[PDB]
Design a protein around this ligand. Sequence first.
Ligand SMILES: *[C@@H]1O[C@H](CO[C@@H]2O[C@@H](C)[C@@H](O)[C@@H](O)[C@@H]2O)[C@@H](O[C@@H]2O[C@H](CO)[C@@H](O[C@@H]3O[C@H](CO)[C@@H](O)[C@H](O)[C@@H]3O)[C@H](O)[C@H]2NC(C)=O)[C@H](O)[C@H]1NC(C)=O
Ligand code: A1IJY
Ligand code: CL
Ligand code: CL
Ligand code: ZN
Length: 575
Amino acid sequence: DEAEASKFVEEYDRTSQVVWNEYAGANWNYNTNITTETSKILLQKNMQIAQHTLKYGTQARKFDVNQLQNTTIKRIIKKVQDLERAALPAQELEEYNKILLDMETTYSVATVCHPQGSCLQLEPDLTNVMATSRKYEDLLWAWEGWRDKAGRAILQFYPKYVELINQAARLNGYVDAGDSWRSMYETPSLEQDLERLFQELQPLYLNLHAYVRRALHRHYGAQHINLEGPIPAHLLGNMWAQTWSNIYDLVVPFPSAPSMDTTEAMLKQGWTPRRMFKEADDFFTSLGLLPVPPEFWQKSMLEKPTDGRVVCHASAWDFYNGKDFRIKQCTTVNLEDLVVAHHEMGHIQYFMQYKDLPVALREGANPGFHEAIGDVLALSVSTPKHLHSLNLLSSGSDEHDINFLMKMALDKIAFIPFSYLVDQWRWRVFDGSITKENYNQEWWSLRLKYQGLCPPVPRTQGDFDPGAKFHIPSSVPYIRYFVSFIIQFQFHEALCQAAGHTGPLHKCDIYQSKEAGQRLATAMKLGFSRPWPEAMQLITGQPQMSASAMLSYFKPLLDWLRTENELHGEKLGWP
Ligand SMILES: *[C@@H]1O[C@H](CO[C@@H]2O[C@@H](C)[C@@H](O)[C@@H](O)[C@@H]2O)[C@@H](O[C@@H]2O[C@H](CO)[C@@H](O[C@@H]3O[C@H](CO)[C@@H](O)[C@H](O)[C@@H]3O)[C@H](O)[C@H]2NC(C)=O)[C@H](O)[C@H]1NC(C)=O
Ligand SMILES: C[C@H](N[C@H](C(=O)O)[C@@H]1CCCN1C(=O)c1ccc(C(=O)O)cc1)C(=O)N1CCC[C@H]1C(=O)O
Ligand SMILES: [Cl-]
Ligand SMILES: [Cl-]
Ligand SMILES: [Zn+2]
């Protein structure tokens, strides 16, 4: 009756755990040891997973979900009927598995070489060049070189990947793969919701862009910077211009205020990756949240290992037995990686909070929620006060404040258009409005229209700049990070009120608030069990996504930018 459904979900649950546990293992062993062997064993455990999905997913398809009374079991069964790639016929499944492997690998082993000099990798070499060099020509060398070797090299596999991920979405009942992705939020009004959210951030973003443009004009000179045109995409301190905080020192509002490079100070005081994660764990436990188990310290890879190996992109790992969780990060000892550690630590925290739900229901209330936990804590960590107490700053005034808000704005506000544009591009690739004759040009339309950037070198057929960003070859959806950046402010705003904080939201530090831990924990325990507005409502007292907490956090900076931009006559925007 209803009792065959009960028995099925029970059985899918027990067998999931085993097969997922074995595949997590092999997937780890390869990400920390790119070989042809580990390559194999994984392409192997991929088959086993696929066959477990096909068999439970076939059975789930046989139940009429209409007729189910139990809401939890309805929801599990509905989700298991989505086989994903396992829906592909054997040949294409094999081809698709090969393509993704080849895209990841290509991206991860790319190097940019000086002629008769030596060869730079993405992490940490090209990252450091992008972060610290202040020579137009050196930045251009790294920016173009990366697109030339990672970008172009992905172009050969993308149309084939597109057809396969589309085929699988069709055979699971969606129209294309972007439709499939959008459905993880169960929110039919999503595109307009995000559009509305994006439009509310424009005044802050335009104001920051104009102010930074003026600062680059001053450093790199009038012949290199059009004061009414887009910013050249290689001057923002980051490979993708997706965060700008590495150029903080070109744009300091109040340089007469005392300041310490945090990065400078961590190095002096002999901080290690271990310390960075220990600090993050301490922040989690200060709120009454879970510590990572002892196993996590034994088993994680928290630095690039030394013995000539690895996938360096930071990621968090659930191994699906509720005891083994891990992080794999090639940590640099800087502020940027300290934030990243917090980010990954929040994914770990979610894994532990939801470890007792059925597996099908082990996900964020929405993917945006999974992305926001670590970030919320890190907004507290980043406060001057908190950093003072870490012995990483000297630490008052209106001046110090604006400076601080400007550091934050170079991370949070600048990323808003970036994080928005990625899936706008991919959605259009998936639904077939953009073709391989068009990939790059349409990537540039979006970079220009949302971010107000231009390529420093004309692009030519043969370029595929999207493949130069990790999530594109690895096929990881990106809109999550846009949702994250909005909702992390809302959460931060709510946790500050729970914690008894008063006055300006950007002074809040929720370290050691047990009230704040409780809101988060009950939200995270829900997993993917309830529509996400219910978790929003638990954390924040209402159920909608809203820009107003972000706007209100940055409100002093927006007043400052307007006054400053107006003094100088800035024309906000670009043509
Ligand atoms: C609809 O069915 C759900 C899910 O049922 C659970 O999974 C099924 C496949 C069956 O195997 C059931 O045996 C199993 O209960 C019901 O949800 C579950 O409700 C119970 C309360 O009976 C929750 O249990 C709690 O568990 C903790 C420790 O784990 C205890 O401290 C609590 O005191 C309590 O016993 C259980 O967590 C919950 N399961 C999930 C995953 O949500 C659900 O109640 C049912 N709806 C109704 C009212 O019919
Ligand atoms: C470095 C951060 N890395 C990602 C990430 O952590 O999101 C990595 C790679 C892809 C996802 N990821 C996870 O570790 C992760 C693991 C599991 C889950 C889940 O189980 O639900 C979700 C994510 C990132 O890319 N970021 C972080 C912020 C901005 C974005 C970027 O750098 O472009
Ligand atoms: Cl680009
Ligand atoms: Cl997403
Ligand atoms: Zn993440």
